[PDB]
Amino acid sequence: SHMLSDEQMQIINSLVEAHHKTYDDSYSDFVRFRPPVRRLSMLPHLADLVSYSIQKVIGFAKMIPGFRDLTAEDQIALLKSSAIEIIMLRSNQSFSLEDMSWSCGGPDFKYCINDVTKAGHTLELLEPLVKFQVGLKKLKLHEEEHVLLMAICLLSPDRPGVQDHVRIEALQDRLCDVLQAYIRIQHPGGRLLYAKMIQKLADLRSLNEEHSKQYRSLSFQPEHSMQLTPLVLEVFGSEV
Amino acid sequence: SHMLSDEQMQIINSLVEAHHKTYDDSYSDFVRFRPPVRRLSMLPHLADLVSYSIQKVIGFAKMIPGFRDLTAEDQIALLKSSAIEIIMLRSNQSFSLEDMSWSCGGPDFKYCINDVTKAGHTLELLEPLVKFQVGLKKLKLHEEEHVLLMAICLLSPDRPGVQDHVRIEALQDRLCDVLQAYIRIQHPGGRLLYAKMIQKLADLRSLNEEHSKQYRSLSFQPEHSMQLTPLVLEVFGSEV
Amino acid sequence: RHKILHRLLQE
Amino acid sequence: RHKILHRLLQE
């Protein structure tokens, strides 16, 4: 009944290309992380996984149409507040409904709930997490929709620290359009998908909040914070 | 012609035991460091080697008779300024005159000058380093003398940041005694050894100074400092 | 200060 | 601040 506009389509080519450039389905770079071990035994390996991911999320972000033109401060503000959410969204790519875990190799790079516990996190986080991963996986998103959801999550103007919350609101809306249009046109059987997707964003906030609290506690214990990486400390730190 | 006193001897048992407790001749813990790779390719692995060593040097220090009774500030001040020197001294244990390198396994955990270069250091440091390692190895120190030299180096009152530089001067002298006495009594053929040993301390300062400058440069480049560890950043940082 | 972040967001 | 160092020098 319709068809995406040239502009919208070029945006999709950019996000998809950006993701391919910042996400390897082989997970070959994991051999460079401190090896996993199953007190907080998995902390070193997971800290490295997360850190590596932030580096990847930043690369993606820099390629989101519009982002580069924001003030470094807002880029930072947005990255800092959404980082963890973007990592949870992209992680879905490795999540397996089969064994309810992230399989990036295995048995060495297969991450179960138990493992994340050995990194200092509880079921109060992991419970909703896997639940979110499952529900999200069931949506069978087209790569195009997966990349949009990520770009949309990052440009949420409702982030603590954001300045020009009006230009951010605009860009997120432009992307929300392309996503809505795309599902209507390219997604057979997807009429309530959009709704289901925006809802996922809301579930992300709860996961984020929980993670932040659990992170703060871990963060204050020097014997544990010393296992983290400088970038993780910077991105998740309370630093103004 | 003499014989160590009971007190001096108990000190030697403490330093030797302390070293055994904080130094593994199997280097089995290295598999937990980020794997080496031969821009600054070895930086991640070596940062982890150094970091691990600081943790070990701290353990040793805490067992040096007298140290625990200093002010946390002086303990820190002493650790911060001597850390790198203690690591160079203890590294001798793994240095091989054969291949002029530190062999803690291999070929994976064998460190040549080239490798340290891939971690951001130059021959301006590595040149005197190996030279120092060689000369030091040639001294064939008894374990007892090796542990004393380390305890003596750590209690050098001439460190920037030191407060009670008089109690530190005292303790270092007490240890210098036990070392002198020991060589006279237990070291056949060692008459100029003591002199050769105190001289090594002086060579350490040059290596330290050089390392500090080279470290400072690496430290200011965020793309490199992000490869370091929180403890390394803390110990070698300019933080007052 | 976010030195690392500023550096990575730089191209 | 040397939080980590203070923590390790603690027993």
Ligand SMILES: CC1(C)[C@H](/C=C/C=C2C[C@@H](O)C[C@H](O)C2)CC[C@]1(C)CCC#CC(O)(C(F)(F)F)C(F)(F)F
């Ligand atoms: C275990 C996690 C890393 C999850 C797994 C995601 C999977 C992948 C694989 C692939 O799809 C590529 C993706 O980029 C990452 C997402 C959040 C998690 C539960 C987060 C676990 C964590 C944490 C921390 O709080 C700490 F390490 F300190 F405990 C940190 F945030 F500070 F780091």
Ligand SMILES: CC1(C)[C@H](/C=C/C=C2C[C@@H](O)C[C@H](O)C2)CC[C@]1(C)CCC#CC(O)(C(F)(F)F)C(F)(F)F
């Ligand atoms: C390569 C080094 C680590 C040397 C090798 C020593 C060997 C061993 C093995 C065993 O005997 C047990 C010992 O504890 C350590 C000593 C100093 C060195 C040249 C130091 C290399 C370095 C460095 C750094 O500047 C960085 F990583 F950033 F480049 C750091 F200081 F910040 F870390």
Ligand SMILES: [Mg+2]
């Ligand atoms: Mg919207």
Ligand SMILES: [Mg+2]
């Ligand atoms: Mg003296």
